[PDB]
Every structure is written in C-alpha cells, then in structure tokens.
Amino acid sequence: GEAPNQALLRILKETEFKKIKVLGSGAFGTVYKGLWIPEGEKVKIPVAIKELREATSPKANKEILDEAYVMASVDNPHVCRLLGICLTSTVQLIMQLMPFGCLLDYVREHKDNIGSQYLLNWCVQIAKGMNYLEDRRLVHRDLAARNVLVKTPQHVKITDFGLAKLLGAEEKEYHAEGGKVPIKWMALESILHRIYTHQSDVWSYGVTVWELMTFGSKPYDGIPASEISSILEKGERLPQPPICTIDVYMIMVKCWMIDADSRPKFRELIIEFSKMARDPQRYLVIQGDERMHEEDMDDVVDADEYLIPQ
Numbered sequence: 001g002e003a004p005n006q007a008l009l010r011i012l013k014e015t016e017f018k019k020i021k022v023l024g025s026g027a028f029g030t031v032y033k034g035l036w037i038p039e040g041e042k043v044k045i046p047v048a049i050k051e052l053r054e055a056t057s058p059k060a061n062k063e064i065l066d067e068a069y070v071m072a073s074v075d076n077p078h079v080c081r082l083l084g085i086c087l088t089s090t091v092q093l094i095m096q097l098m099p100f101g102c103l104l105d106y107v108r109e110h111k112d113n114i115g116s117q118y119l120l121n122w123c124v125q126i127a128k129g130m131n132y133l134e135d136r137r138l139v140h141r142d143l144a145a146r147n148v149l150v151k152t153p154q155h156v157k158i159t160d161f162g163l164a165k166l167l168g169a170e171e172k173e174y175h176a177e178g179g180k181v182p183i184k185w186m187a188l189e190s191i192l193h194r195i196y197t198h199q200s201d202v203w204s205y206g207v208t209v210w211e212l213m214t215f216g217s218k219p220y221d222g223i224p225a226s227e228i229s230s231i232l233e234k235g236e237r238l239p240q241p242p243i244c245t246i247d248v249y250m251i252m253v254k255c256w257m258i259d260a261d262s263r264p265k266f267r268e269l270i271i272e273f274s275k276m277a278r279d280p281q282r283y284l285v286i287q288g289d290e291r292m293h294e295e296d297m298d299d300v301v302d303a304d305e306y307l308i309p310q
C-alpha cells in the first residue's frame with residue numbers, strides 16, 4: 001500500500017533445472033518434480049516445476065504473469081512462494097517442492113497416526129495463511145485441502161493461485177464472468193453470483209476444516225455439483241465430523257452462514273483455533289490420542305527455504 005514491493009522475480013533458463021517425475025498433470029499443464037541447480041552455486045534445490053499449456057490468447061498469457069506476480073510478491077510462512085519463472089513458449093513456474101504432497105492426501109494416508117494437536121495446528125496455519133492474503137487484498141477463490149501443501153507434517157502452506165485475484169482499494173468484491181469452479185467449496189453467493197470476497201473464502205476455509213477433520217472425506221459425497229446451491233438454501237450443511245466437539249464444529253457452521261458478514265473472519269479463526277490449540281484434547285476427540293505425537297533421497301542437495309537465507 002505504502003511500501004514498495006521489492007519482491008524479487010528471478011528468471012531461470014530452463015537448463016537451470018531438470019525434471020525427474022511428474023506429480024500432477026492436467027489440461028492446464030503439467031507440474032514436475034525436479035531439481036533446480038543455479039549455476040555456480042552448487043546446490044540442488046528440490047522444486048516443483050509447473051509447465052503450462054500454450055497460451056491461446058494474450059489474455060490467457062497475461063493472467064499467467066499475474067499468478068507469478070502475486071506469488072513472487074507474497075511472503076508468509078504459510079503460503080507458497082514462487083522461486084522463479086521461466087519464459088519458454090510455455091512458461092514454467094518454479095516453486096519449492098512440498099515433499100509430502102497436499103494435505104488432502106496426507107490425512108488420508110495417516111488418519112491412523114493423526115492426532116488432535118496436529119489437526120488444530122493445521123487449521124491455525126491455514127488460517128494464518130489465508131489471513132495474510134486478506135492483508136494483501138487478495139482473494140484466493142480456491143481454498144481446499146487439495147490446495148494445501150505439506151512442507152513437513154508439522155508445517156503446511158496454501159498453494160493455488162490459478163484463480164487468485166487482487167483487489168482494488170475501492171473494491172470489497174470480485175466478480176467473475178466465467179471459468180471452471182469447485183462448487184462444494186464455494187459460498188452460495190459465489191455460486192449464485194460469482195461474487196467473491198474474503199468472506200467467500202472463509203466458507204472454503206470451513207469446507208477445508210471439514211475435510212481435515214473427516215480425514216479426507218468428500219464434501220457432499222454422492223451428491224452432484226448441480227444442486228449444491230439448492231440444498232445450501234434449504235439449510236443443509238456438512239454434518240458434524242465424528243471427531244469434533246460442538247465447539248469446533250460450531251465454527252465450521254458459522255463459516256457456512258448464508259450471510260457473508262455473519263461468518264467468522266480469518267483473524268478470529270486464527271485466535272480461536274489457536275486457543276483450542278493449547279488444549280487440543282478438550283476440543284477434538286480422537287481415539288488413542290495419548291498415543292500420538294527423487295534420484296536419491298539425499299545427495300548433497302540440502303535446499304530450499306534454507307538457500308535463500310542465513
């Protein structure tokens with residue numbers, strides 16, 4: 001707002017990195033797991049390279065530069081950062097690898113060892129991430145568990161910016177002509193009016209909590225995307241996760257408030273899960289909670305968040 005944005009965009013020649021394997025593939029493009037080796041510095045930084053499908057229009061292409069723009073410019077522990085971009089005919093964005101994949105996946109793999117302290121911390125981190133975006137006047141528009149990456153099980157980050165939009169000083173809303181959207185994560189207004197606001201994200205934040213508390217369950221499983229709005233109006237809502245006390249579920253519920261301004265706010269959500277964080281057991285009941293807490297896996301390739309700073 002006042003401060004100059006000295007976020008640095010580095011540009012990398014495609015020969016600076018190599019692609020080992022592919023994690024994700026989509027019409028949108030392909031994202032590879034690979035290594036980045038800046039010349040001279042000898043280090044190998046594990047990264048995810050997202051190679052994007054050829055730009056059909058200038059507009060499509062222009063939005064690719066927007067994504068990178070926000071992503072390079074955003075620094076917070078809990079949001080992903082662009083490491084660098086590469087301007088081949090099909091651009092590639094280089095990002096730090098999240099060695100564990102997307103939380104969505106993680107919870108499904110270890111429900112057995114997932115414990116209360118973890119789930120609440122995750123919430124807090126996700127809420128911190130999101131709050132930061134609110135601070136920067138950005139609307140994510142795609143929060144979901146799939147969209148949360150796991151750096152280390154103890155640490156997570158918000159990941160997807162394909163749909164992120166930055167807001168005008170005079171703007172408290174974003175309106176979208178069209179696209180492809182994940183309905184079951186959307187606030188009724190967005191589905192009804194393609195109106196997006198930080199509060200529409202909060203709704204998502206909640207579907208995201210539900211995902212995590214039900215260890216990977218699908219929102220409105222069996223129900224088709226078509227009527228999500230119907231039932232949403234009629235008052236239906238995702239049920240209480242078996243693990244959840246009313247206190248925690250009650251927060252998921254407020255998120256799904258129809259009135260946008262009756263929904264919690266990220267800064268609040270932070271403090272509240274932060275509070276439940278200290279005495280996790282009291283709020284989330286997990287059975288046996290007391291119980292719980294590339295080419296080569298390592299090759300003189302210690303890197304990433306560490307390379308950038310002291």
Ligand SMILES: */C=C/C(=O)Nc1cccc(Oc2nc(Nc3ccc(N4CCN(C)CC4)cc3OC)ncc2Cl)c1
Nearest residue numbers: 023024031048095096097098099100101102104105146
């Ligand atoms: C679960 C959501 C998802 O699919 N996430 C995802 C898929 C592909 C690519 C990226 O980008 C990305 N990924 C990572 N780390 C990462 C992501 C995904 C995985 N997977 C997902 C697919 N299963 C089959 C294999 C493991 C693994 C990852 O680390 C290896 N880091 C950064 C980025 Cl941008 C996300």
